[PDB]
Amino acid sequence: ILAKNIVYVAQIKGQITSYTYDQFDRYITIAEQDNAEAIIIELDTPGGRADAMMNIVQRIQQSKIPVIIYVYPPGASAASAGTYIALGSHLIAMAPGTSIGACRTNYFIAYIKSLAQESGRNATIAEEFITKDLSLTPEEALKYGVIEVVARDINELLKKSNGMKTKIPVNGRYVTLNFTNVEVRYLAPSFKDKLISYIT
Amino acid sequence: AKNIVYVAQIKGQITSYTYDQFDRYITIAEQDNAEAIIIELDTPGGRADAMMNIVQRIQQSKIPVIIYVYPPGASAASAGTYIALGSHLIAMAPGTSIGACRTNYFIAYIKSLAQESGRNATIAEEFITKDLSLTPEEALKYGVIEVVARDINELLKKSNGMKTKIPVNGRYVTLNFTNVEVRYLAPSFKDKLISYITD
């Protein structure tokens, strides 16, 4: 026979809107319901410094399982509200060839700085995202302590995150990721998701 | 509670040891009645031969074996391309190659592998007789492979519903990656070493 821990993977491409929050909620909900070891959101977001964001961030922070924001596929970028979402998550991995930061108020600074500090990721850089239109390369990003992992695909990501400690608690406890006997389940975007899209 | 798809890598030159690996992976897959197994294949080649034995292994496999020439920059070469032409499904990631790297028997053989899987055999020959190399897109266009996919997930999405190119235990199968779980299989320790030594 056979059996193991589950990891869910879901994409979230395009601009972040009020409709986005519902997606995060769906995916993270499904994952929570099955006690997934974690969930990876492959995230490629490009522009319009939104606000549905901190509602998403609250979502993540209150999630009952780790949420890994993976800025993938190559060419993807996480900007404006992307980068908040990420800085507020439990782990940030990045595929080579992607970016993070701003694409090419003091309130917002206060905010990015906050997100960074509570997850021990570099807040001086965080600020510079907003105050210098900074854009990091996964390697620079990792050097500077903004992200935790650089991975070419889901599988590297799993191997490299294995055993790493969550950067912010998961329901009060810091968790050590154990992707040792894991099964990955791919979740696809719904039909409304699908349409509410092209129509944008 | 779903269907399992296994994923395994096989990088580097193909030797008599390699067979052992396919056998292991394919065996694990068979034993759990996987919906299928994907071998991410990167094979630089330069004339080897363990191949003929591996291909029989695949043909006799009790579940579909999808040869996926991956990661970007990978090459399915010489030995590789026979293994692939002899499999159930061939996908390729963008930025990879198939064919020769850079007789009146090996030709008969590539031709054969091609015909029995309905993949273009005029090109197959041209691999060996014109040291030809194809790009996933050209490969697709020419009818050598079945799928071009950026990552395991596209691969599953694009292959879903496709019919196997050669039978699986006598029956052609239609892939159904509809409620699937993916399990990644890592190279063992011997494998890991026999690499450093087979260097």
UniProtKB/Swiss-Prot annotation, chain B:
Complete-protein stretch covered: 20 to 236 of 441
Question: Of which family is this protein a member?
Answer: Belongs to the peptidase S14 family.
**Where along this sequence does the record place binding of substrate?**
G45, G46, R47, A48
Q: Where is the active site?
A: S78 (nucleophile)
Query: What quaternary arrangement does the UniProt entry report?
Result: Homodimer.
Give compartment(s): Membrane
Q: What does this protein do?
A: Protease that cleaves its substrates preferentially near hydrophobic or aromatic amino acid residues. Can degrade casein and the stomatin homolog PH1511 (in vitro).
Q: Which cysteines are joined by disulfide bonds?
A: none
Question: What protein name is recorded for this chain?
Answer: Membrane-bound protease PH1510
Q: What mutagenesis or variant effect is reported for D131A?
A: Reduces enzyme activity by 97%
